[PDB]
Amino acid sequence: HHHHHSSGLVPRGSTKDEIFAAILSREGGYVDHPDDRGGPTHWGITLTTARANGYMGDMRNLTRNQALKILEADYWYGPRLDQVAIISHSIAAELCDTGVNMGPSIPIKYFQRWLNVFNDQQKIYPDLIADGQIGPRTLSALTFFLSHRRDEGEMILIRALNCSQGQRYLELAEKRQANESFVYGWIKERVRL
Amino acid sequence: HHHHHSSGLVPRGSTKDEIFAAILSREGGYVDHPDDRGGPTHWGITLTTARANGYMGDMRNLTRNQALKILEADYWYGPRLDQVAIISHSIAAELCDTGVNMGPSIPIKYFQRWLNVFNDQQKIYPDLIADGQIGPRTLSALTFFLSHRRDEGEMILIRALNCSQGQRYLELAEKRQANESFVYGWIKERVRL
Amino acid sequence: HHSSGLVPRGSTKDEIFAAILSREGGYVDHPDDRGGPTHWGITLTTARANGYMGDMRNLTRNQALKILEADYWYGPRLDQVAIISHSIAAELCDTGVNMGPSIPIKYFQRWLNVFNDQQKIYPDLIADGQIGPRTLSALTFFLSHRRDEGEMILIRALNCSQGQRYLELAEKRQANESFVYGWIKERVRL
Amino acid sequence: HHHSSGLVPRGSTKDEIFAAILSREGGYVDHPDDRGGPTHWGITLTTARANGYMGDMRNLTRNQALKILEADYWYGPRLDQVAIISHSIAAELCDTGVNMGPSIPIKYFQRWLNVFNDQQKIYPDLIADGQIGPRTLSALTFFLSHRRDEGEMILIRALNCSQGQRYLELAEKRQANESFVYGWIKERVRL
Amino acid sequence: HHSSGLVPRGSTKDEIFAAILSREGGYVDHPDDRGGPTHWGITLTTARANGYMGDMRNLTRNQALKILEADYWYGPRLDQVAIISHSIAAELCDTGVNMGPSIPIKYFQRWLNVFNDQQKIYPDLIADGQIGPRTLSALTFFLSHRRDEGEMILIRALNCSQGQRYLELAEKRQANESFVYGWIKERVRL
Amino acid sequence: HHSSGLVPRGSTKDEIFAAILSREGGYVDHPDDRGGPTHWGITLTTARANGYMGDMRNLTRNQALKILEADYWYGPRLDQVAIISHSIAAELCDTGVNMGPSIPIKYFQRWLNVFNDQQKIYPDLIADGQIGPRTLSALTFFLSHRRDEGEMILIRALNCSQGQRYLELAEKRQANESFVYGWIKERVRL
Amino acid sequence: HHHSSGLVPRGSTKDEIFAAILSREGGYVDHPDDRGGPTHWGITLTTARANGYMGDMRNLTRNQALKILEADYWYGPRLDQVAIISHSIAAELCDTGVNMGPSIPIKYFQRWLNVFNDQQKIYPDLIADGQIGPRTLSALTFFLSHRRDEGEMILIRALNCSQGQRYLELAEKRQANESFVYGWIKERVRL
Amino acid sequence: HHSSGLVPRGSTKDEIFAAILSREGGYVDHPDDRGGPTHWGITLTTARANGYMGDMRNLTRNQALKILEADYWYGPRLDQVAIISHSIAAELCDTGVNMGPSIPIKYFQRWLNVFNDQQKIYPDLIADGQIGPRTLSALTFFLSHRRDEGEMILIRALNCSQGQRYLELAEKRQANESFVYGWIKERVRL
Ligand SMILES: N[C@H](CCC[C@H](N)C(=O)O)C(=O)O
Ligand SMILES: N[C@H](CCC[C@H](N)C(=O)O)C(=O)O
Ligand SMILES: N[C@H](CCC[C@H](N)C(=O)O)C(=O)O
Ligand SMILES: N[C@H](CCC[C@H](N)C(=O)O)C(=O)O
Ligand SMILES: N[C@H](CCC[C@H](N)C(=O)O)C(=O)O
Ligand SMILES: N[C@H](CCC[C@H](N)C(=O)O)C(=O)O
Ligand SMILES: N[C@H](CCC[C@H](N)C(=O)O)C(=O)O
Ligand SMILES: N[C@H](CCC[C@H](N)C(=O)O)C(=O)O
């Protein structure tokens, strides 16, 4: 039943601020949706999402600034992409862009699985549990990966993440759970092979 | 295969500092364990746990202070019990005590399920996903629960958590995955009906 | 059953049954799709299963108490438990009224198996939900060392099982959330 | 586990059933550990301890063994309460109980009482839990009020049918002796 | 089948069929989803399957008897059993009419397998529900040890299988409870 | 069974059995897990199941023939089929000797069901693998429309079922590939 | 979906097989939407579009329909390549393919080639993928080198056996016409 | 297959096959439990399946190339794809050599189905892994609008499928982690 934000695309290299600015522009003000999709949004926020984040007011009075804090709570601070960003701005921004469209745990689990494959049979760091949750272990794994592979590793991990997402879009489009025009555009703007 | 710390009990009302101090005393220095249990510990830390948290040194040189930071990363900061503690010291301390014996996600999922039952058909706050992960939504749910039920609610939620843990200990003891003397002692010191 | 209101913790058998007869007092007719007619909280099927062949309108308060005692006390043999521990018997009776007597008796047997120390003190019981000589002998041997402490710990263990069961029932909408909150609240102690 | 060692004549009493076990399994008899191990008067170490005998198994008297058999196969299953309503049904449940475990024949007994209650006109359906309590006793009382002595004999033959078919299934899995099953049909089945 | 009335214990083949032809005599309507209308207890499907290509109204009592004997006597080869034991053949025929012939024949083969010791008197039969030379040879070798006792014991064993099956059918509402009670009653002996 | 050699297409019952008695003549050892030693192709289990209580060494060729005819001809009731069509009976017998008699009989019943239109010529048979009055009546009504064509077509249909089954057996290594190739080769026609 | 509308004589060529489809399904024929909808020269809208005809279905010529049948039932399955090695096997696969879809008979063909390779002495086992490529062609080449014309006839009769048994299973689920199956055994089965 | 070393991105068919023949050069004997003898990277089974009946020691480099082209080019019909798009054909060939040709062809078909716009541009293909007229016609219609862009996007989509497949293979220890890291590294672009 979960409303995310698979409504448009931001250019590659876009920051957290630009990702959330693009959601607040493309989904600005009141937009109706069916009850089975979280119902109507104000600045992209459903009543359930607003209440889950502690907005107890009338949804017609929700300001753009309050909506931004709610987006940041669900898609940046909640999943601890602020902590990822201290180690790698580009990995944090990629996880955030995929998180707003699929929900943050999806790309984080792919992230953990890819860090496990690149740890060289656990010589560089031990295998993570793919729980979808950024904590000290995942952050330490990313730190040791980037110490050994440097900036080449960063770019490779982003491409690896794009591969996981691309194949997920194939499976969703096949079950009619993703728009085919959207998936074609995503590959054109986000996939760097 | 996962080494936690179900080795002893701390008195009810014990703080985070006392919970971790008791682990460092009862599991002080080198203690051997079979390879299928994470192998040997130094200050209760396995080689895998130390490496996962970024200790790259020799396990015989791991200081008590470094071990404390590793325990706090896995059982306090990692699961965000520091954020829970800002709202309720007693709920954070209870989650921490159960977390060191079963692994933090177990008690956190029970915590989320109990907050869902006490939200009165989603009038006070919407249902959480029981993902085992403390983030803004779970913290906002605890904030609204404690605003409506006050200190009585806090104590009731701790007792509810004890019930979930007690029944889990029955199921573990039945599969020989928990010591029966330990479970008898746990009910005597921790269960306040 | 009768999950219809909270009884003070540690209520005796008589108070448990008195509280049912008060909260559900008096002949109240209902259509066939709602158990048919009730009297003193007894359904037509419960009365007939216990040998009342009369009109439900003529069921006396005294006959209703006998039926309750048969289904929730003598039937499950809590009279025999009470000879060893009136407190454990009263706790099994209160839970039995809410869930059906076999549920708490099975938790009781499973907990006695955990505390039998790898079968040194007594062998493992079958968790059949039936109080007989073996379950009674197991409770007797458990209480043999530290009677005071053992009784209190076993009741705390039964509360843990029942509390987790209330979580699972509330999650399936088979228990009222206010009831479950009140049930824990009544039992909070230091 | 149980006592499938011999047969007693049709119409044998509870006292005769237990006396026959104490004679055919009298004193020490060795058995392998995977069968409860050695018996004294037919009692395993586990059975004696579960019934509160804490002594040495070599000092277990015939009389203590009889109390343990009665606890497991008569008083525990509440066949004493059945016997007040029908001595012949109680004796038949007890004879089968000592061979199979008392819960097996009691469940068949409840299922047959449910069939003979005529779509719940005479009494409501029992839960077939294998446990004798006031409801099962009340159902037997109402069955025997409407069917009288004919019903009592009919219910015993119905139980014999359930037990006979169970012996077929057990013999097929090698969990019952075939000579025993042939002798059991010969002595006990009256249909 | 023909579960319609109780026949005295030990009825012959002729009496089993005579009883069906009397209790279901002439035209009797039944709903289309249950084989539709019967003449002398024979459905159109049953008649056609046995080579009756005429009109149901013109089906004689004598033609109906042949169809019954084909489906419940000659088809299952009970004529060959009858050469060895008329009383076993009559028992299998009575049960076959009620349940379908393969049910009692498989019980028959399973019981012959238990009474062959450990394949010392004869080897285990496949319980296929089909009477053939091996099943006939097994009955012959079983009866060569204590004929009267064996026949009596094997009929008692078959009665046990059939009685338990009546419990299972009554429980699924596929057999009338009065029928089952009357069936056991007719067979009670000392 | 007897998968041991290819017999000319359309061999009679007598020739099918004669070929088994020649290719497996006298004493032949086989491992205990495969029925053990044969005399005239008869295992001790097969002999005893058919009432031979003597010594295997004293089993005559003539006694072996009777056992073969009981298991592969009279038991499956191919004698009754032979009255309607000797060529269908001979085909079922040859396949029965190779696969066990119930396999080809069930294919036979399934094919009769397809060629009954929509139950217009005769009703659907249960594919139980048992030859009885209904299967015989269905073959009689099938053959009453174009006897020669029908017999030929039904034998072709049976050949199709059996050939596909040989593919499945060869794939599981339960049939020799040279055998299967030779089996089809013998039956190739224009 | 396919063309189970008629039979052609034994020994019919690919040209005759396709000519027979174009005659029995000539011009417009209505069919319900749940069966691919209406045909022109036996071609559905979906079949024509999948083969690159972008025009109006009413303007589809007999000759364009023939190219579409050949694409789906001859060139696509590579029966042209089979035909170089054996015209008679290619024609038999094509006749079955037009009724069932070409992959069904090709898989049976591969499974029978695996049985006749004599435990992989003459050629190794094929994957039964339903697809004609160099391996399946090489296996047919080596089979026909060791078995010659007898093998070719034997492999066709083996295919007929697989198809006949498949018709039994389809007729039983009401997915094939019984008169058609009877006529198919009569005309095509030569065993 | 040949997952044995990395080829530069966009390598042609000839370079893919040249790189196999260099990295796996020359007759190298192995025991029967390791594929037996290899020559130019061809196993005994691969050579025999492609019609080489000679001694593996005499296999020429030219014969090895023909076998590779049969299994990884002409066999899967990448020669026909190449007429429409040499770039897509080369990418399917490179993936086919590593995984088996049906894997990338099935991803290719599934991606063509996603980009057919709810079947407005061409109907959905069966993802059978077989390049035939329908798959070729679908690629032709896809490339009909924005040939340049479509080709590049379809190759990026195939890289996504193959990259995720390498994750799953590395997780089951069926792909080398250094290989997978190098495979992505070779393909990083801006
Ligand atoms: N695997 C840990 C928790 C993992 C937390 C992980 N998601 C992190 O990145 O810290 C455990 O059971 O102790
Ligand atoms: N349920 C959210 C994530 C829940 C995070 C939760 N564990 C928290 O307490 O913030 C979602 O899919 O957007
Ligand atoms: N003898 C029984 C044990 C269960 C009786 C038990 N519920 C009790 O007495 O407490 C049996 O072997 O099946
Ligand atoms: N076997 C018991 C009845 C079990 C009680 C159960 N029927 C309920 O009250 O839920 C008896 O014969 O009294
Ligand atoms: N006369 C036997 C037939 C069994 C044949 C079967 N045992 C086989 O040969 O496979 C019977 O009485 O069923
Ligand atoms: N002669 C039939 C017997 C079928 C009997 C079965 N159709 C039934 O009555 O239940 C046959 O040829 O198998
Ligand atoms: N059906 C194809 C063979 C498929 C290729 C496959 N056998 C592999 O190389 O993995 C053919 O007849 O050539
Ligand atoms: N007609 C085939 C479609 C698949 C052929 C395809 N793989 C191609 O040509 O690309 C069928 O109906 O089963």
Author numbering:
A (entry chain A), B (entry chain A): 5 to 197
C (entry chain C), E (entry chain D), F (entry chain D), H (entry chain C): 8 to 197
D (entry chain B), G (entry chain B): 7 to 197
Task: Quote the study's own text.
Typhoid toxin secretion from the bacterial cell is mediated by a unique transport mechanism that requires the activity of TtsA, a specialized muramidase that facilitates the translocation of typhoid toxin from the cis to the trans side of the peptidoglycan (PG) layer of the bacterial envelope. We have previously shown that TtsA’s muramidase activity exhibits exquisite specificity for L-D cross-linked PG. Entirely consistent with the chimera studies, we found that TtsA is organized in two independent domains: an amino-terminal catalytic domain and a carboxy-terminal substrate-binding domain, separated by a bent helix that forms a hinge between these two domains. To gain insight into the structural bases for substrate specificity, we solved the crystal structures of TtsA and its close homolog Sen1395, which exhibits different specificity.
To gain insight into the structural organization of TtsA we solved its crystal structure using single wave-length anomalous diffraction (SAD) phasing from a seleno-methionine derivative crystal. The structure was refined to 2.1 Å resolution with an Rwork of 0.19 and an Rfree of 0.22. The crystals belonged to the C 2 2 21 space group and contained four monomers per asymmetric unit. The TtsA structure shows two defined globular α-helical domains separated by a ‘hinge’ that is formed by a bent α-helix. The amino terminal domain (amino acids 1 to 64) contains the lysozyme-like catalytic triad (Glu14, Asp19, Thr28) situated under a ‘flap’ formed by a loop that is anchored to the domain by interactions with three short helixes. The carboxy-terminal substrate-binding domain (amino acids 68 to 180) is composed of 6 anti parallel α-helices that organize into a helix bundle. The helix bundle serves as a support for a platform with a central groove, which together with the catalytic triad-containing flap forms a ring-like structure. Diaminopimelic acid (API) could be modeled into this density with an optimal fit indicating that this density corresponds to the muropeptide stem (or a portion of it) of an E. coli peptidoglycan fragment presumably bound to TtsA after lysis and carried through the purification procedure. Comparison of the structures of the different molecules within the TtsA asymmetric unit revealed two different conformations, one conformation shared by chains A, B, and D, and another conformation in chain C. These two alternative conformations, while overall largely identical, position the flap that contains the catalytic residues either closer or further apart (~6.1 Å) from the substrate-binding groove, resulting in either a close or open ring-like structure.
